[PDB]
Amino acid sequence: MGAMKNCVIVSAVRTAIGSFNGSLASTSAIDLGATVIKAAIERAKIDSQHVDEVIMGNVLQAGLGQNPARQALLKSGLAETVCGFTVNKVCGSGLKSVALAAQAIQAGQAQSIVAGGMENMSLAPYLLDAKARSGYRLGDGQVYDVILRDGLMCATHGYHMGITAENVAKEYGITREMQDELALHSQRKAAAAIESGAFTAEIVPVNVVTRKKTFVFSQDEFPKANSTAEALGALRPAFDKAGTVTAGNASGINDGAAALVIMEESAALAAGLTPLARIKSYASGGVPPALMGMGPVPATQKALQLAGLQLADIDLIEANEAFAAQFLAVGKNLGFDSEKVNVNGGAIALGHPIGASGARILVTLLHAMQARDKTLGLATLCIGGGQGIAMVIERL
Amino acid sequence: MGAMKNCVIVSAVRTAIGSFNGSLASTSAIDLGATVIKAAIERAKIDSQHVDEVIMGNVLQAGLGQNPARQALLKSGLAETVCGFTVNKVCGSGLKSVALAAQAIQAGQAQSIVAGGMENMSLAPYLLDAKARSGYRLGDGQVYDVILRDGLMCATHGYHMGITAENVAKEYGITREMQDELALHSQRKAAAAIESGAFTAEIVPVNVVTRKKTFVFSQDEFPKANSTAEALGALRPAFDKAGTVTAGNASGINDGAAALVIMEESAALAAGLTPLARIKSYASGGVPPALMGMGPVPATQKALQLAGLQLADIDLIEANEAFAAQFLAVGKNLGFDSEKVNVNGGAIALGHPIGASGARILVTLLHAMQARDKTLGLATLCIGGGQGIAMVIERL
Amino acid sequence: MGAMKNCVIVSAVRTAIGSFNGSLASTSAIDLGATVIKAAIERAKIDSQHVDEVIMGNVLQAGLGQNPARQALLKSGLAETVCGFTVNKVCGSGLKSVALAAQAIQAGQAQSIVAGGMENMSLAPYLLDAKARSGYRLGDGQVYDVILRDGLMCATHGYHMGITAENVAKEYGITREMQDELALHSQRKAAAAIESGAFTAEIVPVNVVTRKKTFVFSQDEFPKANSTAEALGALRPAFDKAGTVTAGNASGINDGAAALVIMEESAALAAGLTPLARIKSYASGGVPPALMGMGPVPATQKALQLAGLQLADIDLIEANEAFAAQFLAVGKNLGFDSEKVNVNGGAIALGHPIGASGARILVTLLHAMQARDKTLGLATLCIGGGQGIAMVIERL
Amino acid sequence: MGAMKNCVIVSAVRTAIGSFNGSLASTSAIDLGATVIKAAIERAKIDSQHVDEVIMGNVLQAGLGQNPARQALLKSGLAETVCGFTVNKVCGSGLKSVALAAQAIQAGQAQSIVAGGMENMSLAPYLLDAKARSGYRLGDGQVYDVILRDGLMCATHGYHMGITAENVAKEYGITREMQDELALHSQRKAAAAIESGAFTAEIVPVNVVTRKKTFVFSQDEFPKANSTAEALGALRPAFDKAGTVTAGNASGINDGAAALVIMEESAALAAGLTPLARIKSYASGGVPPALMGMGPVPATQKALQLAGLQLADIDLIEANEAFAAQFLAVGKNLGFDSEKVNVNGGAIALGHPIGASGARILVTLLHAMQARDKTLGLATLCIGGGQGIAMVIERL
């Protein structure tokens, strides 16, 4: 039988993250993906004719046309002979795409892949029912927000992700005040990272050209400057009248992309490129949809166990902040050393472009590891529908 | 470094394929997908607790809710700890899912996976523009058919897959007469198969209940009974008033699903199960979007090479019949022996539910191989956006 | 001061009435209008250049373009110098248009007017909310059935005209049996009148060209052949599950038009044309929206008073059958002699194209009066929003 | 045979005119209508129980519900026994409504009517095709802006009212510079009228109540303070690149209502109320659709002949400024003394809520006549689809 191969990250880049109807609200998911795919390739210094595949996560595919991943790879300038496909694992899509690239490389089926995710929630459409096709006939119908139907509502329970967060908050006893405390801490870490230029290396600018003008978008815009504990404690519950989750202790609706060049190790070295990290393990884990926020627990355990590691071995962790409730409960459950976690801020401040986040956090992890000279890293996140995904990387 | 593993198919099953607004038009893609997932598991006789993952292709995801593959798996009865995700490689999606399943198994990542695809084109929705979200403000807008926008129009050139078929007809000299003759051949072989019970083993019945009456769908309904050369000869071109492509020499818009249980070889034997074929290789290839019908050429060339085989080594072949124009160009380019191709009929008679067709043709191939006691088989198909995928299987 | 003039009907024509999605479902309200306008002019023998105005009732104006009455007159072949406007008094609109034409002639403001009404309920559109113009932003919306929103739901209470009919049933002790008995009688009279050629004189045929083919629509299609007291008594209530109103004891949703030439008496004589009747009086009356079915009471009372008449002086009556419940309550309230009412059947059998019905009953009244050589006629109907209108005509 | 009666205006009121998406954008046309109906009755000091009818113009009736005039009337607090109906003569609706009230009163069918118009263009909906009712089936559709379909595009020619304006400019040689000079002059006269309080008497405040804001709207907000020749001359043409017509020399899309109490003269005196003016005559005229802007020519000539007057007899004139090109063509053709026309500014400055404008200009004329102590007044305006309407009043 063949022998498994080692797989390395050779570059990692992301766009800044746009606010809902903000700076990226006229730049399609596919143009955001093309942008990062191109920049990833440039930064890796790889010969672009040697890219075997592109794998991109994208959750709100409605109306974006055939195979958005292929559209993005073509717009990036890659050759027509470079194949690609679009991954939908909801919030995990962007990391799952990276895991699939690693898997294909490790299994000898390719040598170089560009993998990540992309999402423009601002541009998500509205949907008419199949009933529109066959005819309404008589009586009113419904117009469906696609963000909600395909991206933020649980298809098992018909209620918002928010409510799964509340469920996790009751089950693990995570209080309103614990959530807001975390939220402020994420905002402060983000604000220092942004100010001190910690994200400069990882961000590729996007040129936004409009009828009125052209401008360059290169700074995360979702952070809420000058956030305070009292402002946060003043907010009303978003999803439950008697609830704990608010707009201030939850991530948002956001736009952005991220991509990495993944390569077989001995081929990266023979081509005279510089490996930035090895992909050591990855795993997916499943939980009840009602408690989807806990997905990272089984995923993280499997990934650790597949790497031959203990959690305490890990130097830096990016655990996604879709809701402070789920992020705290996961952290409580596994016993995270929280000073190793989301050291430059997390999604409550930075935003959550769902199909891109999984890859975005991996980008942020690797650059934080390089800046602080750390060796071992963990990226994980919860996934709508009751799943989680995790990946461990080791710096070179 | 780990040793790679062998992957085997342990069951293979499909629904009968529904005509547009036909027998399956009220059964959701997700329910079709659950039916085949459950049936594949039952037929395999595998303990359902041993399923590691479910991978399903699905192209018109718009409005189907979070992660359709995960919904299907939960509906099929699998536990909530079973992970899954949804693949979009357009027409290729369903075979790509099986290829990914086999890769995970080969790589030691999983031991048992259900993979395939599912599509209900009848139930595809209509889409309002992003403008609807931000506001039309003044002036009209458009309401978009999702079938066309995400499934049948080229996102590169903005025209129908029918036009790519016309481009391929010119390039390779495939005339209307040539196209019509293949169409009749296909209708004929499909009718003989139906008549002889050749599809009985592979089809899982779907119960369709409506208040007026409840009925069992178990027979492909797209085939045109009593098709003739004369009748085909009289149709008007569908896409190009001076063209060669018609509704009679192209597949249709259809509903259906297919799935297979795939396992690590030794896990199959340890569970006392009966391997039906080994997956020998698989590959993807890219061609210009304008000539997407030619996708099978580079995919087949790569997959034969990976398998260490020549085209002449293959005993039976399933090459999808999206359009006779591209089916014929492909067979001419590669030198297929046409008596080994689509022996029970192809998509011009059977139908093309896009997300599913790739797994559908593989199911059909395996059963055909079993019926004829053949050893080596190839499944391949073109993909909108200019791709191709192929897989070689070897009977056991 | 000038003195009031006398006004006479010179012609009276209607289309046959179409069922919902029936024979007239692809002929625009405006084309129906033009047909009857043109025909009324031909049958009156008036010089087309002498038409001073066209007044047409039309309730579902949405999407029909500027001033439907004006579009209809232009299509009819009248000169661009002939003015026109569109009236909306809901169910009254068609009779209101005639009353206005008569008032204008009586007041010396014009000599010849064509008036009536037109509706194509089958072609009525659906509406997105103003929120579409501003933008949905986030969250679901509705898509509104214009028939219901602008035609059939009470704008004061938000419930169906249906419910106003249940209200009246109660207020006046009108049982399900009494309603179904009336319904059966209407169906018999109408089938009898159609069989016997009673509508031949008043109906102008419509040429309906479909993509495939052409036919002539000239016979009322809503009547229900072989209606029986038992089938009717078997029906489920349509609007309240403890209710009395059914699809069998109410009119339907329908397509059609009607028009009449009205002239100043002395100018009709000077042109050598034959007055068919004199418009003796007209009136409108108001009642609670909840009891809109009773509108005919004050309208009829006032109209008789303005005509110097008592109910008993009237030889023939057309009292619209929107709902048997209100038609019976009106009849009981006023003491109708039922043998004189709706002698050729009413709307329960014939249909209710709401904009046209007011003119349609008047057309049917005049022709019945001619065939039975009667002298005094009354036409009245109820109007959604709590109104009624009535007109008294005197044959000559 | 009775004798014709005299009709007087007893009150005249309007809302301030809102800009598109401006201060009135959240207030329904019906509410605007109710507001002016109530205020008119209050100003007249009439006993509300003496009101026989309400007749209101309204052009974009789509989705507004049954019989908007009836709704407004009920909303105003009038008794349910008061009938009303809604008029559509496009831009002319509001003045047509007053003419119809006058006609009814002259002809002795009523003694007190409230008449006017109402429009909220900001809240006009979007519409799906009849195809939505029967089903799109396959292929795209359109979503239609009601403002355009029912209110601003020619139903005969399918192009914007602005194009009819270009037709008129070319026909009558009305240059860009002539049009821009008129626009400036109307802006100045409006600014001067606002500065000196000339609108205070005629305007009734509307209370606008939003969660976001609460405030009283009482001042016209479409006029452009500090308009200049140079700014007007720099604007691009709006409807045609070689065109003359711009946003600066055409009226806007606007929201407003206006209404007047009308009464039989002797009943007025008997009631101890003060007649403000006598309605002396009214007429409608027709012209080709393509040249709709010229409609006021035949309407005015008939109105004058019917009143026994020469143009020069008229002391003050309100000729609607839908487009500068049409307004000037009209004045050239009739030889208007411009010093007497639109003395407080016209629609280029004040706006054009289409169903209300015909009433609005009448209210404006009356009050200006009072301020300047003038005796004869003329109100006229052009109408989409190729009509005009005019009215002559005589101050008392």
Numbering used by the authors:
A (entry chain B), B (entry chain A), C (entry chain C), D (entry chain D): -2 to 393
Quote the authors verbatim.
Here, we present the crystal structure of C. acetobutylicum thiolase (CaTHL), a type II biosynthetic thiolase that catalyses the first step of n-butanol biosynthesis and condenses two acetyl-CoAs to acetoacetyl-CoA. We reveal that CaTHL, unlike other type II biosynthetic thiolases from aerobic bacteria, is regulated via modulation of a redox-switch, indicating that n-butanol production and the relevant metabolic fluxes in Clostridium are tightly regulated by thiolase. CaTHL consists of three domains: an N-terminal α/β domain (N-domain, residues 1–119 and 249–269), a loop domain (L-domain, residues 120–248), and a C-terminal α/β domain (C-domain, residues 270–392). The N- and C-domains form a typical five-layered fold (α–β–α–β–α) observed in other thiolase superfamily of proteins including peroxisomal degradative thiolase from Saccharomyces cerevisiae, β-ketoacyl synthase II from E. coli, and the biosynthetic thiolase from Zoogloea ramigera (ZrTHL)14151617181920.
For comparison, the crystal structure of EcTHL was also determined at 2.10 Å resolution. As hypothesized, there was no disulfide bond formation observed between the two catalytic cysteine residues, Cys89 and Cys379, under oxidized condition. In addition to the absence of a disulfide bond, the catalytic cysteine loop and the flexible region had similar conformations to those of the reduced form of CaTHL, confirming that EcTHL is also non-redox-switch regulated. The flexible regions of EcTHL and ZrTHL are well stabilized by direct and water-mediated hydrogen bond network; on the other hand, in CaTHL, strong hydrogen bond interactions are not observed between the flexible region and its surrounding region. Considering that the flexible region of CaTHL undergoes an order-to-disorder conformational change depending on the disulfide bond formation, it seems that the stability of the flexible region of CaTHL is not sufficiently high, leading to disulfide bond formation under oxidized condition. This would confer the redox-switch regulatory mechanism to the enzyme; on the other hand, the highly stabilized flexible regions of EcTHL and ZrTHL disable the rotation of the Cys378 residue and hence prevent disulfide bond formation. On the other hand, ZrTHL and EcTHL seem to be permanently inactivated upon the oxidation of the corresponding catalytic cysteine residues to sulfinic or sulfonic acid, and cannot be switched back to the active enzymes under reducing condition.
